[PDB]
Amino acid sequence: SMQEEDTFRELRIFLRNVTHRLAIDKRFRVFTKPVDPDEVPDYVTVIKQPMDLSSVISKIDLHKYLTVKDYLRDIDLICSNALEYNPDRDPGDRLIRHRACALRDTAYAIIKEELDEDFEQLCEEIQESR
Ligand SMILES: C[C@@H](N)C(=O)Nc1nc2c(s1)CCCC2=O
């Protein structure tokens, strides 16, 4: 209905704002764009489902997220991909892992503090009805 499309539009506005706040944080610059296979040839082979904050924005605008949980699955994927691609004890690996965990924690904390539980429940019930 018109009421339901208003609800999903509010969700998209909220997700764009959260994603923007993540993307402008200097700690998360390595997660803002897709991995250029020129610079990192082994990435496209080791990571089967790449995800980054620019791809998240595109999915928002394609109406791919109908719930905050759908969004957080892609935030979680950015994080899990980084942990999988950076398993070594080397400080370059440890730095990216730390930033990945901070990206995930930051997104979850913003959503916990700023997204009303009843709004997320409404999104889920509209989604489960389709
Ligand atoms: C130092 C070495 N471990 C390194 O540069 N690792 C990198 N990891 C990632 C890069 S570079 C960009 C895409 C996301 C990602 O997980």
PDB file of C-alpha atoms and ligand atoms in Angstrom:
ATOM      1  CA  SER A   1       0.000   0.000   0.000  1.00  0.00           C
ATOM      2  CA  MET A   2       0.898   3.689   0.150  1.00  0.00           C
ATOM      3  CA  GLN A   3       1.467   3.387   3.909  1.00  0.00           C
ATOM      4  CA  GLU A   4       3.853   0.465   3.405  1.00  0.00           C
ATOM      5  CA  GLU A   5       5.842   2.235   0.687  1.00  0.00           C
ATOM      6  CA  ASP A   6       6.208   5.229   3.034  1.00  0.00           C
ATOM      7  CA  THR A   7       7.590   2.842   5.660  1.00  0.00           C
ATOM      8  CA  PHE A   8      10.210   1.398   3.323  1.00  0.00           C
ATOM      9  CA  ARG A   9      11.142   4.890   2.141  1.00  0.00           C
ATOM     10  CA  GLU A  10      11.798   5.946   5.751  1.00  0.00           C
ATOM     11  CA  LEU A  11      13.931   2.814   6.172  1.00  0.00           C
ATOM     12  CA  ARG A  12      15.983   3.737   3.077  1.00  0.00           C
ATOM     13  CA  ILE A  13      16.513   7.289   4.353  1.00  0.00           C
ATOM     14  CA  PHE A  14      17.697   5.901   7.692  1.00  0.00           C
ATOM     15  CA  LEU A  15      20.037   3.351   6.061  1.00  0.00           C
ATOM     16  CA  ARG A  16      21.557   5.977   3.762  1.00  0.00           C
ATOM     17  CA  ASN A  17      22.309   8.165   6.760  1.00  0.00           C
ATOM     18  CA  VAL A  18      23.949   5.342   8.735  1.00  0.00           C
ATOM     19  CA  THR A  19      25.958   4.245   5.684  1.00  0.00           C
ATOM     20  CA  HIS A  20      27.105   7.809   5.037  1.00  0.00           C
ATOM     21  CA  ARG A  21      28.317   8.155   8.630  1.00  0.00           C
ATOM     22  CA  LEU A  22      30.314   4.938   8.244  1.00  0.00           C
ATOM     23  CA  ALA A  23      31.716   5.933   4.845  1.00  0.00           C
ATOM     24  CA  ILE A  24      33.115   9.283   6.015  1.00  0.00           C
ATOM     25  CA  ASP A  25      34.950   7.721   8.979  1.00  0.00           C
ATOM     26  CA  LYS A  26      38.686   7.599   8.184  1.00  0.00           C
ATOM     27  CA  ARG A  27      39.011   4.190   9.878  1.00  0.00           C
ATOM     28  CA  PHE A  28      36.693   2.625   7.294  1.00  0.00           C
ATOM     29  CA  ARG A  29      38.154   4.014   4.055  1.00  0.00           C
ATOM     30  CA  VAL A  30      39.361   0.548   3.008  1.00  0.00           C
ATOM     31  CA  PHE A  31      35.717  -0.598   3.051  1.00  0.00           C
ATOM     32  CA  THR A  32      34.247   2.262   0.995  1.00  0.00           C
ATOM     33  CA  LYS A  33      34.858   0.973  -2.551  1.00  0.00           C
ATOM     34  CA  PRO A  34      35.113  -2.367  -4.384  1.00  0.00           C
ATOM     35  CA  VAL A  35      38.487  -4.090  -4.589  1.00  0.00           C
ATOM     36  CA  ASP A  36      40.220  -3.177  -7.865  1.00  0.00           C
ATOM     37  CA  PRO A  37      41.605  -6.484  -9.245  1.00  0.00           C
ATOM     38  CA  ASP A  38      44.630  -4.571 -10.570  1.00  0.00           C
ATOM     39  CA  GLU A  39      45.845  -3.736  -7.062  1.00  0.00           C
ATOM     40  CA  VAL A  40      44.622  -6.935  -5.381  1.00  0.00           C
ATOM     41  CA  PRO A  41      44.547  -9.865  -7.847  1.00  0.00           C
ATOM     42  CA  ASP A  42      44.064 -12.610  -5.234  1.00  0.00           C
ATOM     43  CA  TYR A  43      41.014 -10.941  -3.647  1.00  0.00           C
ATOM     44  CA  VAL A  44      38.388 -11.769  -6.283  1.00  0.00           C
ATOM     45  CA  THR A  45      39.367 -15.438  -5.999  1.00  0.00           C
ATOM     46  CA  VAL A  46      39.511 -15.781  -2.198  1.00  0.00           C
ATOM     47  CA  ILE A  47      36.399 -13.685  -1.368  1.00  0.00           C
ATOM     48  CA  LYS A  48      33.369 -15.264  -3.022  1.00  0.00           C
ATOM     49  CA  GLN A  49      30.850 -12.507  -2.177  1.00  0.00           C
ATOM     50  CA  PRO A  50      32.539  -9.095  -1.988  1.00  0.00           C
ATOM     51  CA  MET A  51      30.742  -6.276  -0.219  1.00  0.00           C
ATOM     52  CA  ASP A  52      31.593  -2.628   0.439  1.00  0.00           C
ATOM     53  CA  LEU A  53      29.832   0.547   1.508  1.00  0.00           C
ATOM     54  CA  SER A  54      29.399   1.829  -2.058  1.00  0.00           C
ATOM     55  CA  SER A  55      27.684  -1.437  -2.992  1.00  0.00           C
ATOM     56  CA  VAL A  56      25.496  -1.067   0.103  1.00  0.00           C
ATOM     57  CA  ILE A  57      24.367   2.392  -1.069  1.00  0.00           C
ATOM     58  CA  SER A  58      23.527   0.955  -4.500  1.00  0.00           C
ATOM     59  CA  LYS A  59      21.472  -1.819  -2.903  1.00  0.00           C
ATOM     60  CA  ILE A  60      19.606   0.708  -0.763  1.00  0.00           C
ATOM     61  CA  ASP A  61      18.694   2.680  -3.886  1.00  0.00           C
ATOM     62  CA  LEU A  62      17.628  -0.524  -5.681  1.00  0.00           C
ATOM     63  CA  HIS A  63      15.161  -1.199  -2.809  1.00  0.00           C
ATOM     64  CA  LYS A  64      17.055  -4.383  -1.887  1.00  0.00           C
ATOM     65  CA  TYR A  65      16.771  -3.865   1.907  1.00  0.00           C
ATOM     66  CA  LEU A  66      13.284  -4.233   3.351  1.00  0.00           C
ATOM     67  CA  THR A  67      14.465  -4.644   6.958  1.00  0.00           C
ATOM     68  CA  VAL A  68      17.377  -3.483   9.061  1.00  0.00           C
ATOM     69  CA  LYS A  69      18.331  -7.147   9.464  1.00  0.00           C
ATOM     70  CA  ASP A  70      18.828  -7.440   5.693  1.00  0.00           C
ATOM     71  CA  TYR A  71      21.117  -4.393   5.870  1.00  0.00           C
ATOM     72  CA  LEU A  72      23.081  -5.730   8.841  1.00  0.00           C
ATOM     73  CA  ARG A  73      23.685  -8.999   6.983  1.00  0.00           C
ATOM     74  CA  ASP A  74      25.658  -7.018   4.397  1.00  0.00           C
ATOM     75  CA  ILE A  75      27.494  -5.024   7.101  1.00  0.00           C
ATOM     76  CA  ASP A  76      28.349  -8.375   8.717  1.00  0.00           C
ATOM     77  CA  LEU A  77      29.576  -9.606   5.327  1.00  0.00           C
ATOM     78  CA  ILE A  78      31.958  -6.655   4.974  1.00  0.00           C
ATOM     79  CA  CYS A  79      33.347  -7.620   8.381  1.00  0.00           C
ATOM     80  CA  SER A  80      33.516 -11.394   7.895  1.00  0.00           C
ATOM     81  CA  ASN A  81      35.132 -10.981   4.453  1.00  0.00           C
ATOM     82  CA  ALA A  82      37.837  -8.776   5.995  1.00  0.00           C
ATOM     83  CA  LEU A  83      38.546 -11.309   8.755  1.00  0.00           C
ATOM     84  CA  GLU A  84      38.763 -14.109   6.190  1.00  0.00           C
ATOM     85  CA  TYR A  85      41.030 -12.128   3.864  1.00  0.00           C
ATOM     86  CA  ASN A  86      43.303 -11.006   6.760  1.00  0.00           C
ATOM     87  CA  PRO A  87      43.967 -14.115   8.888  1.00  0.00           C
ATOM     88  CA  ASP A  88      47.699 -13.620   9.604  1.00  0.00           C
ATOM     89  CA  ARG A  89      49.362 -12.226  12.740  1.00  0.00           C
ATOM     90  CA  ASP A  90      51.065  -9.527  10.639  1.00  0.00           C
ATOM     91  CA  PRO A  91      50.203  -5.960  11.697  1.00  0.00           C
ATOM     92  CA  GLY A  92      48.729  -5.127   8.286  1.00  0.00           C
ATOM     93  CA  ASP A  93      46.252  -7.981   8.767  1.00  0.00           C
ATOM     94  CA  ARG A  94      45.613  -7.073  12.399  1.00  0.00           C
ATOM     95  CA  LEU A  95      44.894  -3.442  11.465  1.00  0.00           C
ATOM     96  CA  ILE A  96      42.256  -4.353   8.873  1.00  0.00           C
ATOM     97  CA  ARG A  97      40.661  -6.883  11.239  1.00  0.00           C
ATOM     98  CA  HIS A  98      40.452  -4.248  13.965  1.00  0.00           C
ATOM     99  CA  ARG A  99      38.822  -1.766  11.582  1.00  0.00           C
ATOM    100  CA  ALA A 100      36.388  -4.409  10.326  1.00  0.00           C
ATOM    101  CA  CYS A 101      35.264  -5.235  13.851  1.00  0.00           C
ATOM    102  CA  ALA A 102      34.947  -1.510  14.596  1.00  0.00           C
ATOM    103  CA  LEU A 103      32.845  -0.938  11.461  1.00  0.00           C
ATOM    104  CA  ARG A 104      30.453  -3.703  12.532  1.00  0.00           C
ATOM    105  CA  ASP A 105      30.301  -2.543  16.162  1.00  0.00           C
ATOM    106  CA  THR A 106      29.709   1.061  15.076  1.00  0.00           C
ATOM    107  CA  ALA A 107      26.844   0.160  12.734  1.00  0.00           C
ATOM    108  CA  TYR A 108      25.181  -2.033  15.378  1.00  0.00           C
ATOM    109  CA  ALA A 109      25.567   0.694  18.020  1.00  0.00           C
ATOM    110  CA  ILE A 110      24.032   3.387  15.796  1.00  0.00           C
ATOM    111  CA  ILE A 111      21.086   1.132  15.019  1.00  0.00           C
ATOM    112  CA  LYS A 112      20.633   0.119  18.675  1.00  0.00           C
ATOM    113  CA  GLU A 113      20.593   3.784  19.749  1.00  0.00           C
ATOM    114  CA  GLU A 114      18.660   5.380  16.881  1.00  0.00           C
ATOM    115  CA  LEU A 115      16.290   2.858  15.254  1.00  0.00           C
ATOM    116  CA  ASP A 116      12.988   2.345  17.062  1.00  0.00           C
ATOM    117  CA  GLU A 117      12.334  -1.342  17.771  1.00  0.00           C
ATOM    118  CA  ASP A 118       8.702  -0.938  16.683  1.00  0.00           C
ATOM    119  CA  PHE A 119       9.767   0.545  13.348  1.00  0.00           C
ATOM    120  CA  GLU A 120      11.989  -2.462  12.639  1.00  0.00           C
ATOM    121  CA  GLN A 121       9.190  -4.816  13.713  1.00  0.00           C
ATOM    122  CA  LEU A 122       6.809  -3.097  11.284  1.00  0.00           C
ATOM    123  CA  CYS A 123       9.285  -3.534   8.411  1.00  0.00           C
ATOM    124  CA  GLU A 124       9.593  -7.226   9.250  1.00  0.00           C
ATOM    125  CA  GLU A 125       5.825  -7.756   9.343  1.00  0.00           C
ATOM    126  CA  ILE A 126       5.329  -6.028   5.977  1.00  0.00           C
ATOM    127  CA  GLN A 127       8.138  -8.178   4.543  1.00  0.00           C
ATOM    128  CA  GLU A 128       6.732 -11.426   5.988  1.00  0.00           C
ATOM    129  CA  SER A 129       3.373 -10.596   4.351  1.00  0.00           C
ATOM    130  CA  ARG A 130       4.888 -10.457   0.835  1.00  0.00           C
TER     131      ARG A 130
HETATM  132  C1  LIG B   1      48.185  -5.767   4.633  1.00  0.00           C
HETATM  133  C2  LIG B   1      47.208  -6.758   3.979  1.00  0.00           C
HETATM  134  N1  LIG B   1      46.690  -7.712   4.968  1.00  0.00           N
HETATM  135  C3  LIG B   1      46.060  -5.981   3.308  1.00  0.00           C
HETATM  136  O1  LIG B   1      46.327  -4.954   2.684  1.00  0.00           O
HETATM  137  N2  LIG B   1      44.817  -6.516   3.470  1.00  0.00           N
HETATM  138  C4  LIG B   1      43.709  -5.961   2.933  1.00  0.00           C
HETATM  139  N3  LIG B   1      42.464  -6.340   3.262  1.00  0.00           N
HETATM  140  C5  LIG B   1      41.451  -5.700   2.629  1.00  0.00           C
HETATM  141  C6  LIG B   1      41.894  -4.768   1.752  1.00  0.00           C
HETATM  142  S1  LIG B   1      43.586  -4.782   1.795  1.00  0.00           S
HETATM  143  C7  LIG B   1      41.018  -3.981   1.006  1.00  0.00           C
HETATM  144  C8  LIG B   1      39.717  -4.702   0.793  1.00  0.00           C
HETATM  145  C9  LIG B   1      39.182  -5.128   2.125  1.00  0.00           C
HETATM  146  C10 LIG B   1      40.130  -5.905   2.802  1.00  0.00           C
HETATM  147  O2  LIG B   1      39.741  -6.765   3.602  1.00  0.00           O
END
